[PDB]
Enzyme design. Sequence first.
Site: not given
Lengths: 241, 241
Positions: B57, B102, B189, B191-192
């Site tokens: 995403h 994801d 955290g 994203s990713g």
Amino acid sequence: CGVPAIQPVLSGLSRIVNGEEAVPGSWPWQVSLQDKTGFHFCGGSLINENWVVTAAHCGVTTSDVVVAGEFDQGSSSEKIQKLKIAKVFKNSKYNSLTINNDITLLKLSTAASFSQTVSAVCLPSASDDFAAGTTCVTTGWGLTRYTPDRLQQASLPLLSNTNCKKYWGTKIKDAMICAGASGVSSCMGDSGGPLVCKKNGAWTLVGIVSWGSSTCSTSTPGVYARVTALVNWVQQTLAAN
Amino acid sequence: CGVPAIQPVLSGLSRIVNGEEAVPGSWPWQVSLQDKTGFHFCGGSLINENWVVTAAHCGVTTSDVVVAGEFDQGSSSEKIQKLKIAKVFKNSKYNSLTINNDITLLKLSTAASFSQTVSAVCLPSASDDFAAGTTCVTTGWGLTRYTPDRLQQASLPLLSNTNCKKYWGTKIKDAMICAGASGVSSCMGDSGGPLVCKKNGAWTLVGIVSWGSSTCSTSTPGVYARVTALVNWVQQTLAAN
């Protein structure tokens, strides 16, 4: 473009709660994007027989499918066109954190066959002014994420970016436009779905669904990519491809 | 892999509120993904000198840049490596609506130079069992979306998918794993970014940040792509490319 062969019918109920069901086929540019297994995950708009415009955050790939001419997702009886995607064009200025410049073009492998229920929305010119307070319309199956399986519609007013920032703060960038907060939800719009305004007897694509209230609040406006800010990129992309 | 040359220091404060600042360089697989203008929008993890694993995403493109060896985003004095991306490999089973599967792999144009502050996390095997209740660690600059400019860390426990569904309901799929709801946020955290657990003296990537509480609640767990469910795809991708 922007003149449906089956005219839309918008009543007072499009202005409140979660809007109303559309007349079947009356939003003929509206498409469904589905994965290779048939799962509906986003919306989009036909701008001609070979091109669909949608949101960049939908992350469409060439293994996804464009479904045109659909009204009832739960039906296998109505006429639809499942159109393969040849190439995906994401606006290079897209930013997956701020969700700004949230626009992607899909080029179809084979043209859609335009008909009474399948045809194109009009694009604005870069210098068009869609004034705050203008009543516009969003359509889609967005309510199925949370319920009717048929296409819904809602009528809602554009806001100035200054007034939109009262709701969404510094999330609002120049290439965005907001609509709603008038007693109706924006949640019927799928990600990537249309926000259209009728000027000069033709429906023009003013917004593409980026995000809305996480609770579908009737007093929180939806946020859309501002098409007038991105239409020059659209026309350059079509002309080069 | 999974053995930092600069050992992490995790105190009791990593377990509460918004965690704590990491020892500089002690999470050497942690990278920053930035746009062509230098704007940080996602995180990721080095799995060797040519490959970074992140979330699908994030919508990374080949014009984005991998920044390795960074601690302080507001500093121009520390040693970093800005690494161009040659090719992006999105898991074809990714679904931008459910956010399941994801995971995306980035292949670098030129290898990172591994060092004390730049090295790889270990990958699990598909059959590894990371039991509910295991204490794991998430790292990143995620708090800057809302604040410290230096890399943060938090220690938080894995949940069973059954218990995670008490918080997130039918959003939780088999290829997801949840962590937190123990008095600390997961919002540090990016994203990713990584969720790592230490088994047999080595840090192993158990999760990739998908989403968390919209208010960074200390009682709502983060949701991560479950790496054991996706590692076979990772290894096939590396072997074919």
